[PDB]
Protein backbone atom coordinates (compact mmCIF):
# COMPACT_ATOMS: atom_id res chain seq x y z
CA UNK A 1 0.00 0.00 0.00
CA UNK A 2 1.02 3.73 0.39
CA UNK A 3 4.80 4.62 0.33
CA UNK A 4 6.21 6.44 3.44
CA UNK A 5 8.63 9.42 3.01
CA UNK A 6 12.36 8.36 2.75
CA UNK A 7 14.31 9.49 4.66
CA UNK A 8 11.72 8.38 7.30
CA UNK A 9 11.98 9.90 10.84
CA UNK A 10 9.74 8.78 13.78
CA UNK A 11 10.06 9.74 17.50
CA UNK A 12 10.45 6.50 19.55
CA UNK A 13 11.00 5.05 23.06
CA UNK A 14 12.62 1.59 23.42
CA UNK A 15 13.15 -0.81 26.35
CA UNK A 16 13.68 -4.60 26.74
CA UNK A 17 10.81 -6.23 24.74
CA UNK A 18 10.39 -3.37 22.16
CA UNK A 19 10.41 -4.37 18.44
CA UNK A 20 10.90 -2.00 15.45
CA UNK A 21 9.41 -3.57 12.25
CA UNK A 22 10.22 -2.22 8.74
CA UNK A 23 8.83 -3.43 5.37
CA UNK A 24 10.59 -1.98 2.30
CA UNK A 25 12.22 -2.74 -1.07
CA UNK A 26 15.69 -1.87 -2.47
CA UNK A 27 15.19 0.91 -5.13
CA UNK A 28 17.56 -0.89 -7.60
CA UNK A 29 19.33 -4.23 -8.36
CA UNK A 30 22.05 -5.56 -5.95
CA UNK A 31 24.68 -5.23 -8.80
CA UNK A 32 24.42 -1.41 -8.19
CA UNK A 33 24.94 -1.76 -4.34
CA UNK A 34 21.89 0.12 -2.97
CA UNK A 35 22.19 0.86 0.81
CA UNK A 36 19.68 0.68 3.69
CA UNK A 37 20.36 2.54 6.95
CA UNK A 38 18.41 2.38 10.25
CA UNK A 39 19.76 4.66 13.03
CA UNK A 40 18.50 4.77 16.70
CA UNK A 41 19.21 8.42 17.76
CA UNK A 42 19.40 10.02 21.27
CA UNK A 43 17.55 13.16 19.97
CA UNK A 44 15.11 14.15 17.17
CA UNK A 45 18.02 16.04 15.40
CA UNK A 46 19.78 13.93 12.64
CA UNK A 47 23.24 15.10 13.92
CA UNK A 48 22.43 13.55 17.38
CA UNK A 49 24.36 10.56 18.77
CA UNK A 50 23.45 7.08 17.46
CA UNK A 51 22.86 4.26 20.02
CA UNK A 52 22.50 1.71 17.14
CA UNK A 53 23.69 2.24 13.52
CA UNK A 54 22.66 -0.51 11.01
CA UNK A 55 23.88 -0.06 7.41
CA UNK A 56 23.30 -2.72 4.69
CA UNK A 57 25.29 -2.63 1.43
CA UNK A 58 22.81 -4.98 -0.37
CA UNK A 59 24.50 -8.14 -1.74
CA UNK A 60 27.91 -7.23 -0.13
CA UNK A 61 27.97 -6.62 3.71
CA UNK A 62 26.41 -5.05 6.86
CA UNK A 63 28.25 -2.75 9.33
CA UNK A 64 26.94 -1.76 12.77
CA UNK A 65 28.29 0.96 15.08
CA UNK A 66 27.44 3.67 17.60
CA UNK A 67 28.21 7.38 17.30
CA UNK A 68 28.95 8.78 20.79
CA UNK A 69 29.51 12.55 21.47
CA UNK A 70 29.82 13.04 17.66
CA UNK A 71 32.48 10.26 17.22
CA UNK A 72 32.06 6.84 15.53
CA UNK A 73 33.09 3.87 17.74
CA UNK A 74 34.28 0.28 16.92
CA UNK A 75 32.66 -0.90 13.63
CA UNK A 76 31.19 -4.46 13.68
CA UNK A 77 31.12 -6.00 10.13
CA UNK A 78 28.96 -8.95 8.93
CA UNK A 79 29.09 -10.63 5.47
CA UNK A 80 25.70 -12.29 6.32
CA UNK A 81 23.26 -11.35 3.46
CA UNK A 82 19.75 -12.90 3.85
CA UNK A 83 18.22 -10.06 1.70
CA UNK A 84 17.17 -11.24 -1.79
CA UNK A 85 17.94 -9.29 -5.03
CA UNK A 86 14.83 -7.36 -6.22
CA UNK A 87 12.61 -8.60 -3.29
CA UNK A 88 10.57 -6.81 -0.61
CA UNK A 89 12.17 -7.47 2.85
CA UNK A 90 10.69 -7.46 6.38
CA UNK A 91 13.29 -6.24 8.93
CA UNK A 92 12.49 -6.38 12.68
CA UNK A 93 14.90 -5.12 15.41
CA UNK A 94 14.09 -6.65 18.85
CA UNK A 95 15.52 -5.01 22.03
CA UNK A 96 16.71 -7.99 24.17
CA UNK A 97 18.24 -7.44 27.67
CA UNK A 98 21.89 -7.40 26.43
CA UNK A 99 21.60 -6.64 22.65
CA UNK A 100 19.48 -5.70 19.60
CA UNK A 101 18.45 -8.75 17.52
CA UNK A 102 17.89 -8.11 13.76
CA UNK A 103 15.49 -10.56 12.00
CA UNK A 104 15.38 -10.54 8.14
CA UNK A 105 12.27 -12.29 6.68
CA UNK A 106 11.74 -13.93 10.11
CA UNK A 107 15.38 -15.25 10.30
CA UNK A 108 17.89 -14.22 13.08
CA UNK A 109 20.62 -12.48 11.01
CA UNK A 110 22.54 -9.87 13.18
CA UNK A 111 23.07 -9.01 16.87
CA UNK A 112 24.70 -5.94 18.51
CA UNK A 113 25.39 -5.70 22.27
CA UNK A 114 23.98 -2.55 23.95
CA UNK A 115 26.74 0.12 24.27
CA UNK A 116 24.17 2.67 25.64
CA UNK A 117 20.88 1.69 27.41
CA UNK A 118 18.02 1.65 24.82
CA UNK A 119 16.08 4.11 27.10
CA UNK A 120 18.54 6.76 25.61
CA UNK A 121 16.74 6.43 22.19
CA UNK A 122 14.29 9.27 21.26
CA UNK A 123 14.21 8.85 17.42
CA UNK A 124 14.50 6.20 14.64
CA UNK A 125 15.49 7.22 11.06
CA UNK A 126 15.25 4.81 8.09
CA UNK A 127 16.98 6.05 4.91
CA UNK A 128 19.10 5.56 1.74
CA UNK A 129 18.18 3.58 -1.36
CA UNK A 130 14.84 1.93 -0.32
CA UNK A 131 11.08 2.40 -0.66
CA UNK A 132 9.19 1.96 2.68
CA UNK A 133 5.61 0.52 3.06
CA UNK A 134 5.60 -0.32 6.84
CA UNK A 135 7.20 1.24 9.97
CA UNK A 136 5.98 0.08 13.43
CA UNK A 137 7.40 0.18 17.00
CA UNK A 138 5.63 -2.41 19.27
CA UNK A 139 6.07 -4.28 22.62
CA UNK A 140 5.74 -7.72 24.34
CA UNK B 141 12.46 25.32 -8.48
CA UNK B 142 10.74 21.88 -9.04
CA UNK B 143 12.50 18.70 -7.66
CA UNK B 144 13.37 15.94 -10.24
CA UNK B 145 12.72 12.23 -9.39
CA UNK B 146 15.70 10.53 -7.54
CA UNK B 147 16.89 8.09 -8.71
CA UNK B 148 17.03 10.22 -11.92
CA UNK B 149 17.54 8.38 -15.28
CA UNK B 150 18.02 10.23 -18.65
CA UNK B 151 19.00 8.73 -22.05
CA UNK B 152 22.23 10.48 -23.25
CA UNK B 153 24.90 10.59 -25.99
CA UNK B 154 28.39 11.94 -25.14
CA UNK B 155 31.47 12.86 -27.22
CA UNK B 156 34.51 15.18 -26.76
CA UNK B 157 33.02 18.61 -25.79
CA UNK B 158 29.84 17.24 -24.07
CA UNK B 159 29.09 18.54 -20.52
CA UNK B 160 26.64 16.97 -18.00
CA UNK B 161 25.52 19.61 -15.42
CA UNK B 162 23.78 18.65 -12.12
CA UNK B 163 22.41 21.01 -9.41
CA UNK B 164 21.36 19.26 -6.17
CA UNK B 165 21.60 19.25 -2.36
CA UNK B 166 22.66 16.51 0.12
CA UNK B 167 19.45 15.26 1.90
CA UNK B 168 21.20 15.36 5.35
CA UNK B 169 24.27 16.70 7.25
CA UNK B 170 27.81 15.44 6.32
CA UNK B 171 28.15 13.89 9.88
CA UNK B 172 25.65 11.21 8.61
CA UNK B 173 27.70 10.50 5.37
CA UNK B 174 25.04 10.97 2.65
CA UNK B 175 26.19 9.64 -0.79
CA UNK B 176 25.84 11.00 -4.34
CA UNK B 177 26.27 8.67 -7.34
CA UNK B 178 26.42 9.58 -11.07
CA UNK B 179 26.81 6.58 -13.44
CA UNK B 180 27.36 6.77 -17.27
CA UNK B 181 25.77 3.48 -18.55
CA UNK B 182 26.16 1.64 -21.91
CA UNK B 183 22.38 0.82 -21.95
CA UNK B 184 19.10 2.19 -20.50
CA UNK B 185 18.97 -0.85 -18.07
CA UNK B 186 20.45 -0.07 -14.55
CA UNK B 187 22.33 -3.45 -14.56
CA UNK B 188 24.20 -2.33 -17.77
CA UNK B 189 27.96 -1.69 -17.81
CA UNK B 190 29.22 1.65 -16.42
CA UNK B 191 31.74 3.67 -18.52
CA UNK B 192 32.12 6.21 -15.65
CA UNK B 193 31.11 5.60 -11.98
CA UNK B 194 31.35 8.68 -9.66
CA UNK B 195 30.42 8.11 -5.98
CA UNK B 196 30.79 10.86 -3.31
CA UNK B 197 30.73 9.98 0.40
CA UNK B 198 30.06 13.63 1.45
CA UNK B 199 32.72 14.99 3.86
CA UNK B 200 34.89 11.78 3.56
CA UNK B 201 35.99 10.69 0.00
CA UNK B 202 35.16 10.10 -3.72
CA UNK B 203 35.73 6.81 -5.61
CA UNK B 204 35.56 6.43 -9.40
CA UNK B 205 35.48 3.19 -11.41
CA UNK B 206 34.10 1.40 -14.47
CA UNK B 207 31.96 -1.75 -14.48
CA UNK B 208 32.84 -3.82 -17.60
CA UNK B 209 30.92 -7.03 -18.59
CA UNK B 210 29.31 -6.98 -15.10
CA UNK B 211 32.69 -6.69 -13.23
CA UNK B 212 34.07 -3.67 -11.30
CA UNK B 213 37.58 -2.57 -12.44
CA UNK B 214 40.43 -0.65 -10.66
CA UNK B 215 38.93 1.82 -8.11
CA UNK B 216 40.42 5.37 -8.16
CA UNK B 217 40.04 7.10 -4.72
CA UNK B 218 40.20 10.87 -3.99
CA UNK B 219 40.08 12.55 -0.53
CA UNK B 220 39.38 15.90 -2.35
CA UNK B 221 36.11 17.31 -0.84
CA UNK B 222 35.08 20.73 -2.30
CA UNK B 223 31.38 20.05 -1.39
CA UNK B 224 30.16 22.17 1.57
CA UNK B 225 28.09 20.75 4.49
CA UNK B 226 24.36 21.65 4.06
CA UNK B 227 24.93 23.57 0.75
CA UNK B 228 23.47 23.22 -2.77
CA UNK B 229 26.26 22.07 -5.18
CA UNK B 230 26.69 22.50 -8.96
CA UNK B 231 28.49 19.46 -10.47
CA UNK B 232 29.53 19.50 -14.16
CA UNK B 233 31.25 16.53 -15.92
CA UNK B 234 33.10 17.64 -19.11
CA UNK B 235 34.13 14.99 -21.71
CA UNK B 236 37.71 15.99 -22.72
CA UNK B 237 39.66 14.01 -25.39
CA UNK B 238 41.46 11.73 -22.87
CA UNK B 239 39.30 11.96 -19.67
CA UNK B 240 36.15 13.21 -17.86
CA UNK B 241 36.75 16.44 -15.89
CA UNK B 242 34.52 16.95 -12.79
CA UNK B 243 33.97 20.61 -11.73
CA UNK B 244 32.40 21.29 -8.26
CA UNK B 245 31.05 24.88 -7.86
CA UNK B 246 33.14 25.87 -10.92
CA UNK B 247 36.40 24.34 -9.47
CA UNK B 248 38.36 21.47 -11.19
CA UNK B 249 38.12 18.70 -8.54
CA UNK B 250 38.41 15.18 -10.18
CA UNK B 251 39.59 13.61 -13.47
CA UNK B 252 39.18 10.04 -14.82
CA UNK B 253 40.91 8.80 -18.01
CA UNK B 254 38.55 7.21 -20.58
CA UNK B 255 38.61 3.37 -20.23
CA UNK B 256 35.81 3.04 -22.87
CA UNK B 257 35.08 5.68 -25.59
CA UNK B 258 32.30 8.05 -24.34
CA UNK B 259 30.30 7.21 -27.55
CA UNK B 260 29.50 3.88 -25.67
CA UNK B 261 27.26 5.87 -23.20
CA UNK B 262 23.44 5.62 -23.76
CA UNK B 263 22.20 6.59 -20.23
CA UNK B 264 23.08 8.75 -17.17
CA UNK B 265 21.64 7.92 -13.71
CA UNK B 266 21.96 10.30 -10.71
CA UNK B 267 21.00 8.74 -7.35
CA UNK B 268 21.44 8.17 -3.58
CA UNK B 269 21.00 10.71 -0.80
CA UNK B 270 20.39 13.99 -2.77
CA UNK B 271 17.57 16.24 -3.99
CA UNK B 272 17.98 17.29 -7.68
CA UNK B 273 16.83 20.69 -9.18
CA UNK B 274 18.85 20.70 -12.48
CA UNK B 275 20.01 17.99 -14.96
CA UNK B 276 21.36 19.09 -18.39
CA UNK B 277 23.57 17.50 -21.10
CA UNK B 278 25.07 20.21 -23.43
CA UNK B 279 27.90 20.72 -26.01
CA UNK B 280 30.67 23.15 -27.15
Ligand SMILES: O[C@H]1[C@H](O)[C@@H](O)OC[C@H]1O
Nearest residue numbers: 055063064065072075173
Ligand atom coordinates in the same frame (compact mmCIF):
# COMPACT_ATOMS: atom_id res chain seq x y z
O1 LIG C 1 29.19 3.42 8.84
C1 LIG C 1 30.06 4.15 9.73
C2 LIG C 1 31.18 3.25 10.21
O2 LIG C 1 30.62 2.21 11.01
C3 LIG C 1 32.26 4.01 10.98
O3 LIG C 1 33.32 3.17 11.46
O4 LIG C 1 32.83 4.96 10.08
C4 LIG C 1 31.88 5.96 9.73
C5 LIG C 1 30.66 5.38 9.03
O5 LIG C 1 31.05 5.07 7.68
Ligand SMILES: O[C@H]1[C@H](O)[C@@H](O)OC[C@H]1O
Nearest residue numbers: 080101107108109110111
Ligand atom coordinates in the same frame (compact mmCIF):
# COMPACT_ATOMS: atom_id res chain seq x y z
O1 LIG D 1 23.71 -15.52 12.56
C1 LIG D 1 23.28 -14.55 13.52
C2 LIG D 1 22.61 -15.28 14.68
O2 LIG D 1 21.36 -15.85 14.28
C3 LIG D 1 22.36 -14.33 15.84
O3 LIG D 1 21.68 -15.00 16.93
O4 LIG D 1 23.64 -13.82 16.22
C4 LIG D 1 24.24 -12.96 15.24
C5 LIG D 1 24.48 -13.67 13.91
O5 LIG D 1 25.71 -14.42 13.98
Ligand SMILES: O[C@H]1[C@H](O)[C@@H](O)OC[C@H]1O
Nearest residue numbers: 033195203204205212215
Ligand atom coordinates in the same frame (compact mmCIF):
# COMPACT_ATOMS: atom_id res chain seq x y z
O1 LIG E 1 31.98 1.80 -5.79
C1 LIG E 1 32.38 0.54 -6.38
C2 LIG E 1 33.89 0.36 -6.24
O2 LIG E 1 34.54 1.36 -7.02
C3 LIG E 1 34.35 -1.04 -6.65
O3 LIG E 1 35.76 -1.22 -6.53
O4 LIG E 1 33.72 -1.96 -5.76
C4 LIG E 1 32.32 -1.99 -5.97
C5 LIG E 1 31.66 -0.63 -5.70
O5 LIG E 1 31.60 -0.46 -4.28
Ligand SMILES: O[C@H]1[C@H](O)[C@@H](O)OC[C@H]1O
Nearest residue numbers: 220241247248249250251
Ligand atom coordinates in the same frame (compact mmCIF):
# COMPACT_ATOMS: atom_id res chain seq x y z
O1 LIG F 1 42.71 18.57 -8.27
C1 LIG F 1 42.16 18.01 -9.46
C2 LIG F 1 42.68 18.81 -10.66
O2 LIG F 1 42.12 20.12 -10.69
C3 LIG F 1 42.33 18.10 -11.96
O3 LIG F 1 42.77 18.87 -13.11
O4 LIG F 1 42.93 16.81 -11.89
C4 LIG F 1 42.36 15.94 -10.91
C5 LIG F 1 42.48 16.50 -9.49
O5 LIG F 1 43.78 16.21 -8.96
